[PDB]
Amino acid sequence: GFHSLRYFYTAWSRPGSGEPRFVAVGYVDDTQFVRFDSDNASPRAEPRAPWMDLVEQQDPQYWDRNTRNARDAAQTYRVGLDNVRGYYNQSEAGSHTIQRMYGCDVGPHGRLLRGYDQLAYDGADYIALNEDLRSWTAADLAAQNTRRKWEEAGYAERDRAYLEGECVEWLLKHLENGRETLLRADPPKTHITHHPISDREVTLRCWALGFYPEEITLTWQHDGEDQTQEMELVETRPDGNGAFQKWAALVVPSGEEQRYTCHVQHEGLPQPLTLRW
């Protein structure tokens, strides 16, 4: 069905403690497949998914080309940090960060649904390619400097040729080569656990484990009445093996456990689950 190829750049200065650093990662959907770290001796792009490490027979030039591209990108944003700090006339003794996220969403027909390219400076919106893939939105006065530079270099056109072309074609290649990983819909392993607080109260904790993709809905319900304001819902977290975990817990009175149900929705499930202690 639908899917996304997304690249994440982080560049930041380290005044006194060394040269700026540049770290880039790429994801297909919720799976990371590539990294690049400028702090290596001779930095190269590196595979981080099983289908990369073992199916570059398709394109024996992949790593040469991507190492070259990430190296050039690293140099660009190192320069960019100085340009941007000067737009704000910030002191050179403070550390500053540029981030970029760009990529493409494809639909089930294998055509572009939307392309995007967004930048942040020090954690706030700085400049973004508009949805026409033709103009830029600059978030403040300094970012208009970058926009004018980018308008003059005709850079929206290059951005967009990449997003409608290479991005789409590579997303589709990764999905085929990584089909075992990316087109799985592993449903969660679910169970409830039970932790007495006192003689009068107990915590019920509904667990979802090992699932992919990351999207999931966990709710507790009290005999029809939903408990979204009563429960503690933890942020979804990576398991470390390519999948995810989540739980929702609820304090209930002792003796009442049987009246509460946990409801789990995930696209790997044939039907939603209902758990009861």
């Binding site: 690249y7 880039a24 790429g26 590539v34 690049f36 792009a45 992949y62 080309r65 991507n66 070259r68 591209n69 990430a70 050039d72 990108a73 140099q75 660009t76 944003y77 320069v79 960019g80 340009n83 941007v84 540029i98 760009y102 970058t146 530079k149 980018w150 270099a153 850079y155 290059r158 951005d159 990449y162 290479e166 991005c167 590579w170």
Partner: peptide, 10 residues
């Protein structure tokens, strides 16, 4: 692929 840049673009 990573996108390729053009010298310095910022």
């Amino acid at each position: 692929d990573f996108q390729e840049s053009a010298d310095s673009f910022l």
